[PDB]
Write a protein that binds this DNA or RNA. Structure first.
Ligand code: NA
Ligand code: NA
Length: 327
DNA sequence: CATTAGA
DNA sequence: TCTAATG
């Protein structure tokens, strides 16, 4: 956690560079299992060989550990951190819609900068176009203060369209967070569940509403279950407009909401830990269900859930308010 | 790990 | 169809 720091950090830098700049899934994959284990290791690694005794660590990485331990740096690291090509990939990548694949390509073509991106708006697809358009705003954190505003709006219309609609804003905003990155809304409806062959309009109806009134201003992607877009708060009485924020809505079979809701609310840890608990408690928990465990090794049988409570109950835990779903 | 664009 | 990018 801190005794192993630089090492895992150096090691993570390396991985990340392979995967992105190079097309080396493997090396990239090496660095991480490595960085995975060395971080688990309970003692101050004092040398290559020491590390080396580890699983997944070999000569490659050891050698790296020495140099790093020896001098507070790394050449390959100083070299990469320096390299424009590689620098470029890292950056181009920030653009929502641009991954590494594209980033490489853009680069090979000579698109390095934000501006170059503009001059060639044409090479970019719709997504990347919006991404490039809202680049600044995309990078800005969302104030809970605004979070509250947005949430207020979406609930309102939802209800308006159909009253049988259940929506929840999941994420850290759900967990009390002072700010959020983007907004996640989970949605379901009673008439849509595990079997009942869809009702795509169900999603659509609401997207429509939202735009109707001008909350949604762009659409990154719309499918019959998951809409991915851009939203914005009504720029009040002039002098101050809101930044364009990312928003995602997802339709869910009413019969899988809470787990899902459980799950998205997190935190990543609270999940795992809770998840790890249900195991002893004779169960299994995933993004959509909760199955009583059978002895034969495994087992099915989706238990019926009507609230976050049904879940907690099942594993005989304490209902944890989201506030404290911190871990 | 699942969904959507795209070509 | 496959392959990319988001979550
Ligand atoms: Na080894
Ligand atoms: Na990106």
């Amino acid at each position: 956690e801190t005794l192993n720091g630089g090492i895992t950090d150096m090691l993570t830098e390396l991985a990340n560079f392979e995967k992105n700049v190079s097309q080396a899934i493997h090396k990239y994959n090496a660095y991480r299992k490595a960085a995975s284990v060395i971080a688990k290791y309970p003692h101050k690694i004092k040398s290559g060989a020491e590390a080396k005794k580890l699983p997944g660590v070999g000569t490659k990485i050891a050698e790296k550990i020495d140099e790093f331990l020896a001098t507070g740096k790394l050449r390959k690291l100083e070299k990469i951190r320096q390299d424009d090509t590689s620098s470029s990939i890292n950056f181009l990548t920030r653009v929502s819609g641009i991954g590494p694949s594209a980033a490489r390509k853009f680069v090979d073509e000579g698109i390095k900068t934000l501006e170059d991106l503009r001059k060639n708006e044409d090479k970019l697809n719709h997504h990347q176009r919006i991404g490039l358009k809202y680049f600044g705003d995309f990078e800005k954190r969302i104030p809970r203060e605004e979070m509250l505003q947005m949430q207020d709006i979406v609930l309102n219309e939802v209800k308006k369209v159909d009253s049988e609609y259940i929506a929840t804003v999941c994420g850290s905003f759900r967990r009390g967070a002072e700010s959020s990155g983007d907004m996640d809304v989970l949605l379901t409806h009673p008439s849509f569940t595990s079997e009942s062959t869809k009702q795509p309009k169900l999603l659509h109806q609401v997207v429509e509403q939202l735009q109707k009134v001008h909350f949604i201003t762009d659409t990154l992607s719309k499918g019959e279950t998951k809409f991915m877009g851009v939203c914005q708060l009504p720029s009040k009485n002039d002098e101050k407009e809101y930044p364009h924020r990312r928003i995602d809505i997802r339709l869910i079979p009413k019969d899988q909401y809470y787990c899902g809701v459980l799950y998205f609310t997190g935190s990543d840890i609270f999940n795992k830990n809770m998840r790890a608990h249900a195991l002893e408690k004779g169960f299994t928990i995933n993004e959509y269900t909760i199955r009583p465990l059978g002895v034969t090794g495994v087992a099915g049988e989706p238990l019926p859930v009507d609230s976050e409570k049904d879940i907690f109950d099942y594993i005989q835990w304490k209902y944890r308010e989201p506030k404290d779903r911190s871990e």
